Amino acid sequence: PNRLNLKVLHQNPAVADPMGAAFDYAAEVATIDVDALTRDIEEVMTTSQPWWPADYGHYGPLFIRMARHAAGTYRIHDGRGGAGGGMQRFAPLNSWPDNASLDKARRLLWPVKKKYGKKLSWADLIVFAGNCALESMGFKTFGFGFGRVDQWEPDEVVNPEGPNGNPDPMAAAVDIRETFRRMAMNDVETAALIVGGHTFGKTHGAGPADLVGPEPEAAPLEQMGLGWKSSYGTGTGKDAITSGIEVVWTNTPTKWDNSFLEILYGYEWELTKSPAGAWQYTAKDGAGAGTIPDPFGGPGRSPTMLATDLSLRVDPIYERITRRWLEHPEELADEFAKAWYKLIHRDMGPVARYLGPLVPKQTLLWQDPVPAVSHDLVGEAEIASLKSQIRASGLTVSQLVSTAWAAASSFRGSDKRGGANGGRIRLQPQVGWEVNDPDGDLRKVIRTLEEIQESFNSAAPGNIKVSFADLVVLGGCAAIEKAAKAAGHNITVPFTPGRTDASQEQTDVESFAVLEPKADGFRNYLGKGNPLPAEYMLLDKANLLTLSAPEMTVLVGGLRVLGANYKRLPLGVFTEASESLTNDFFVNLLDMGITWEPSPADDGTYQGKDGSGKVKWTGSRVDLVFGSNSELRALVEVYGADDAQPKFVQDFVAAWDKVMNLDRFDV
Amino acid sequence: DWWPNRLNLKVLHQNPAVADPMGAAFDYAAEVATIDVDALTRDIEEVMTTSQPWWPADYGHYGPLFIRMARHAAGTYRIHDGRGGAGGGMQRFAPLNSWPDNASLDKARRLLWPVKKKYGKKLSWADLIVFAGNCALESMGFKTFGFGFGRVDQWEPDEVYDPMAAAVDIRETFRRMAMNDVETAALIVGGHTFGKTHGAGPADLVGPEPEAAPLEQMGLGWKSSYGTGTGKDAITSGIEVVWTNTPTKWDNSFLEILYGYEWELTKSWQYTAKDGAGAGTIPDPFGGPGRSPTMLATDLSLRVDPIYERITRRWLEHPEELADEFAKAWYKLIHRDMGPVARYLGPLVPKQTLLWQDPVPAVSHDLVGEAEIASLKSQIRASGLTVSQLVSTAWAAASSFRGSDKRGGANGGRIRLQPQVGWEVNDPDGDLRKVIRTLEEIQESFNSAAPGNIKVSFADLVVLGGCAAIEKAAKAAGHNITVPFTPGRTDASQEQTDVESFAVLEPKADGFRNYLGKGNPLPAEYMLLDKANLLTLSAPEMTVLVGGLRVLGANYKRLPLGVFTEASESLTNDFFVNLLDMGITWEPSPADDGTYQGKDGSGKVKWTGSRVDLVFGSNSELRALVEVYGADDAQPKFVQDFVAAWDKVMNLDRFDV
Ligand code: HEM
Numbered sequence A: 001p002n003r004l005n006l007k008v009l010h011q012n013p014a015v016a017d018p019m020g021a022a023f024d025y026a027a028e029v030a031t032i033d034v035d036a037l038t039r040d041i042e043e044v045m046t047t048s049q050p051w052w053p054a055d056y057g058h059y060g061p062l063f064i065r066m067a068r069h070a071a072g073t074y075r076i077h078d079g080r081g082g083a084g085g086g087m088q089r090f091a092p093l094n095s096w097p098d099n100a101s102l103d104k105a106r107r108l109l110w111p112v113k114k115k116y117g118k119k120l121s122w123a124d125l126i127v128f129a130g131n132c133a134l135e136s137m138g139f140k141t142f143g144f145g146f147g148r149v150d151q152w153e154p155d156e157v158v159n160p161e162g163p164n165g166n167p168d169p170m171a172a173a174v175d176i177r178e179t180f181r182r183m184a185m186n187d188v189e190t191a192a193l194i195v196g197g198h199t200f201g202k203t204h205g206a207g208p209a210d211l212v213g214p215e216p217e218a219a220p221l222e223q224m225g226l227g228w229k230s231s232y233g234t235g236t237g238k239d240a241i242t243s244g245i246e247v248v249w250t251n252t253p254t255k256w257d258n259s260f261l262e263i264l265y266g267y268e269w270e271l272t273k274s275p276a277g278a279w280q281y282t283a284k285d286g287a288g289a290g291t292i293p294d295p296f297g298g299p300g301r302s303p304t305m306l307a308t309d310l311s312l313r314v315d316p317i318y319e320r321i322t323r324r325w326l327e328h329p330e331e332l333a334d335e336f337a338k339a340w341y342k343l344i345h346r347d348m349g350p351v352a353r354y355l356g357p358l359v360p361k362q363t364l365l366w367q368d369p370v371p372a373v374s375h376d377l378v379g380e381a382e383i384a385s386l387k388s389q390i391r392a393s394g395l396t397v398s399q400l401v402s403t404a405w406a407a408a409s410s411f412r413g414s415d416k417r418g419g420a421n422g423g424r425i426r427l428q429p430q431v432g433w434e435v436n437d438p439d440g441d442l443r444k445v446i447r448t449l450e451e452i453q454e455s456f457n458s459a460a461p462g463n464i465k466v467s468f469a470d471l472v473v474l475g476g477c478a479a480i481e482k483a484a485k486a487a488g489h490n491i492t493v494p495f496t497p498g499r500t501d502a503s504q505e506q507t508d509v510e511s512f513a514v515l516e517p518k519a520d521g522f523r524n525y526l527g528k529g530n531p532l533p534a535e536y537m538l539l540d541k542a543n544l545l546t547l548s549a550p551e552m553t554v555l556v557g558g559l560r561v562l563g564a565n566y567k568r569l570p571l572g573v574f575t576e577a578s579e580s581l582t583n584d585f586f587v588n589l590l591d592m593g594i595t596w597e598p599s600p601a602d603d604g605t606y607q608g609k610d611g612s613g614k615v616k617w618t619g620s621r622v623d624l625v626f627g628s629n630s631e632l633r634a635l636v637e638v639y640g641a642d643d644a645q646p647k648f649v650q651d652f653v654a655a656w657d658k659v660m661n662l663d664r665f666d667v
Numbered sequence B: 001d002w003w004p005n006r007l008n009l010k011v012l013h014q015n016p017a018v019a020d021p022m023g024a025a026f027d028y029a030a031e032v033a034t035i036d037v038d039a040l041t042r043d044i045e046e047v048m049t050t051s052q053p054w055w056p057a058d059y060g061h062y063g064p065l066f067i068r069m070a071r072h073a074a075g076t077y078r079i080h081d082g083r084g085g086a087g088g089g090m091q092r093f094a095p096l097n098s099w100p101d102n103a104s105l106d107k108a109r110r111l112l113w114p115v116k117k118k119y120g121k122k123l124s125w126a127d128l129i130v131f132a133g134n135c136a137l138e139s140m141g142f143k144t145f146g147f148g149f150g151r152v153d154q155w156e157p158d159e160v161y162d163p164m165a166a167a168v169d170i171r172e173t174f175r176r177m178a179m180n181d182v183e184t185a186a187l188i189v190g191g192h193t194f195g196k197t198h199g200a201g202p203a204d205l206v207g208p209e210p211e212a213a214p215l216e217q218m219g220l221g222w223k224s225s226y227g228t229g230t231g232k233d234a235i236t237s238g239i240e241v242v243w244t245n246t247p248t249k250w251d252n253s254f255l256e257i258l259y260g261y262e263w264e265l266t267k268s269w270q271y272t273a274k275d276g277a278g279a280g281t282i283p284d285p286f287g288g289p290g291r292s293p294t295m296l297a298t299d300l301s302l303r304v305d306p307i308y309e310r311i312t313r314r315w316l317e318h319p320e321e322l323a324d325e326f327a328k329a330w331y332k333l334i335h336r337d338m339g340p341v342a343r344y345l346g347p348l349v350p351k352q353t354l355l356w357q358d359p360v361p362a363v364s365h366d367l368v369g370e371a372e373i374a375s376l377k378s379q380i381r382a383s384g385l386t387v388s389q390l391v392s393t394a395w396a397a398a399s400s401f402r403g404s405d406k407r408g409g410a411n412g413g414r415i416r417l418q419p420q421v422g423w424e425v426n427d428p429d430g431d432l433r434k435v436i437r438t439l440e441e442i443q444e445s446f447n448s449a450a451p452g453n454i455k456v457s458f459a460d461l462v463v464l465g466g467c468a469a470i471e472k473a474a475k476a477a478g479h480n481i482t483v484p485f486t487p488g489r490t491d492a493s494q495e496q497t498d499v500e501s502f503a504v505l506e507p508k509a510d511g512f513r514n515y516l517g518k519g520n521p522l523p524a525e526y527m528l529l530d531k532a533n534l535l536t537l538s539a540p541e542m543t544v545l546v547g548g549l550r551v552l553g554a555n556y557k558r559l560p561l562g563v564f565t566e567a568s569e570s571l572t573n574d575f576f577v578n579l580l581d582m583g584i585t586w587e588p589s590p591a592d593d594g595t596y597q598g599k600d601g602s603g604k605v606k607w608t609g610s611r612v613d614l615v616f617g618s619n620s621e622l623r624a625l626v627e628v629y630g631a632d633d634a635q636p637k638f639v640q641d642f643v644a645a646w647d648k649v650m651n652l653d654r655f656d657v
């Protein structure tokens, strides 16, 4: 195998950012004139360019497709992908054969971006242009929210004929369903996306393939980043090759109407081969034959439908809904508006992160909405009383720290989804997770925490009240203060109140299941279904929390000694006196009086026999990789020194503070 | 991965601030200068003698192991680009741990932790291992030259990086470390008067190879151990030979033995005396082997190679010369990659500057203030020198910096001196001999009639004229800006300049000046990436420097390759806003060359280009930065970004600041 890659933790560093450090995305994209931007984009779509002549004299459909391909790489498994930082500029995404001829679109949008510059990120534009194109044709969309930041280096990572080159509609139905289920799109949403997105535009296959050149990443230097140069005929325009199929779906390819489902359910479809050798479907009995317009103004075309678009006619659970839409268009417009809004905004986070004047004024359950604050927040003079009340409630530091971490470690920095906001660790999909230990001391902790707000709120000075979501994090901070005060350090953990409490109706139990950690390395948990070893999954978890190598190291080192790991297992607790935040985990695995040997009862744990032969410690794979990996052993030796205890405690407090406030986008 | 030989921009942010646990307000220079060094030597000495069970010491002394570890840490220096050596952050990280001849050094860095844990953040790992070697050397009868702390350690591996048949091999190996014949002879002889190799077992296969490589696949539980099936106590690492009869003391015994008896027999790997053995040497635990079954791998070339044997046979009866020469050679070896003498800290550093450090005279006059700088700036702007001449001269003097080993830079004033004034890239047939002449006249006229004891040095004038140029160009573009200038450089002389040691600093290909010499391994773009990595420039600083130097007239030989502007010698972002111009169609020039030409303004040619200054519009990750600086509102930000990058690269070698 290959050694673990610590460069994944410090991805997208500051030195690669041309905008500097004093740059605020929201503070500027909240100031543009969206009407002016709409005018600029609308005059970019309708003016043809000789480098890529526009079909029908409208670049709209190209921009809709670019917006779909930008946001169509989201994965609910891991969260990475989607619009996000707009990675279809750098990554393999710009060189995939699936993304053919989308470099041209991003090139055509340069005149818009040139005018605005730093106050309009690429990620917005390639997702806004499409959303404007979809509205330029007469489909009143649902709303748009700017605010997805631009990034400066790539990351780590369905056939038009259906299966692997086999034209079959019923067989492509399951492929479409499975590839759209990874985006978390039910049958209605995926049918609406396929029907709506194909009422516009055409397919580009006018010439035989094998004449196009290489992708942008392996293209000649003089093409300026535009791969897939075609040598067929003129090369571009009427002779453009992008996927090798020549399908034009509707007779109105630059206007929204119910002309897709009427063609699909109107003719009988028979199989035929594209001019470039691809499989497609054409109307049987020569029906049509000169009804669909030609982009450059030549002779008309017989009706033609792709191999996967016919699925919506043979799959019963697609056929039912699409036939209903054929009898009811306004439902199709509604479903497509909502599905498109979900598609381009799925990996963007809480509602408090959308910007601009187009953002809708309603809560959609797929956003995991949390209520707005209905009272003045708890003041600093009053979090002291509440902190003391928590510290004198009989709850051990282990229980409080474990509960606070369990609440606030379900965050996905890739998806901005999860976190401690909303107070969902009390709710059904999350109180029952195995790592959280629904048994034991989570119901007890939650009860003794919500019997504290029940007393504080009733006997409160004015309108000031505290929410449960704040109470779990405040208990974590109180426990850390109590622990550090036992190691001799008098510190205060920073705490910014404001979290609210989400009821059960606003929590989608089905949605909050991919958030479940199959392996949380900080709590020393390793469930089944893990693809990689333990240390790699800890590294992945740390990357998701947007943690760096020093923060991850100090966090695990302090979190073992604080006693917040799975089932209170004594794995990696390298301290004699627990319930105290000290330096002991680092200074005890650098000890060379201890010889680490795998446990004879093979279960993936190691036991470090002392000098005299007695077993002193008992680590695990996650714990011992810090003493083994050279570039993590380098970091352990920083906190394992003799003078670096106060530095360690302040670094742990900083990392804990960073983790608790990951989800706080409202402040 | 899927795109091998793609432009790897990840090299420009090596060792970021994210991965540094010490923070940003941590300066190692002010930390290590406060440690007690006598306490450090006492701690190291108590570590060396006190053997530990997991790696027992030969003769009860870890000295020779620490000497060997310090040699191997500092023995990877490459004169080609300076990378390697004991610069901190190499020997303890992924490539150099698992490494066939770094055998026992994995359990020789963890042997010093009882000291690093005592001192912690105020003593780096590189400083610790090299100083451990030096103190081990000094605790076994030898008196070294000196020592200087300051090797700040990095937190990330660098993505970059029998009879006489052995004489030429070791000669080449030590020649590509910048070591001449006397220094390499002294280094080998001195280093092999200390210790043995180790014991031996059946073979390297059945022994130190249970997936034995510390980081690749050693396995957890054995965090660093070339484990052996033999015992690893007294016999280890699978090669047995001891050179001198006193392996823990400096005296003339290596080459008294070597010149004592013949070695025609090779046992199993050089025997002794052709069956004249005995008990001259001493073993580690007890017993005693033959009379020096020594001279490993037939590296007695010091007695066979005709030019080694001369100096070596001289050292047979003149041990003082060997002592002194080994002192100087060792001091050079462990301090080669550390830079100017202003960078050495601590109380051990000797007050004697050698010619290999590129010495620069210390300041004797008073530095120019904020009024004399303005007066000189005006005097040098109104002096008949164009912006292109001033900018290309200032960039020529300060782009000769090798950030890997901090050698070169604008300080020293050596562009007026022979090794640099005659380089092809510093086009001497052009204006260099004229620009330096008029700047010399300026300084003579200035400090001849100076106010008080304030004087200006030539090394200051080249840089100041560089700043007085881009100020004029920016003012001729609507943006009046002030370029920071820190006086303090002093100018060297040809006596302190090593002509044959600066040949390695010659730019084989400079991308910012659009130079490309014959004999380039990689294309013109990867050479630019290497150049900017050597200058310690991020990616945006690369981009802004290239786009400024193009339009600002700094091209090699004033070639109009990449001047995508019509306003001559003015600081604008016309390079970016015209490189992204999609109205022109690039194509290789009909001359079978590496130059392009973007025609189709209408149907005519304009804006000749090249691979260096056209990959910016091609590479997506660089296309992003160009689109940042080529926007409509980016005109005033590009000016200040260029000024910041220019200031960074001019003050790049300023360690005396
Ligand atoms: C199973 C699902 C889908 C398949 C197999 C599919 C496949 C394709 C293919 C092969 C093309 C031709 C590309 C070209 O010729 O340049 C195309 C074009 C297009 N697709 Fe899709 N697509 C799917 C879903 C979607 C979705 C969800 C949307 C929008 C939300 C969409 C919008 C478009 C548009 C507007 C075009 C026209 C592009 C142009 O005119 O250049 N498609 N699709």
Ligand code: HEM
Binding pocket: B064, B065, B067, B068, B071, B103, B104, B170, B187, B188, B190, B191, B192, B194, B195, B196, B197, B198, B237, B239, B299
């Ligand atoms: C062509 C030049 C050299 C060659 C081929 C060479 C080779 C070797 C080899 C094979 C070993 C055995 C290591 C072991 O058994 O663990 C060794 C050890 C050693 N080397 Fe060198 N070496 C060279 C130059 C030097 C230099 C320049 C120094 C400078 C200090 C040095 C210092 C040492 C010392 C002190 C040891 C003893 C290691 C111990 O006691 O564990 N050698 N060398």
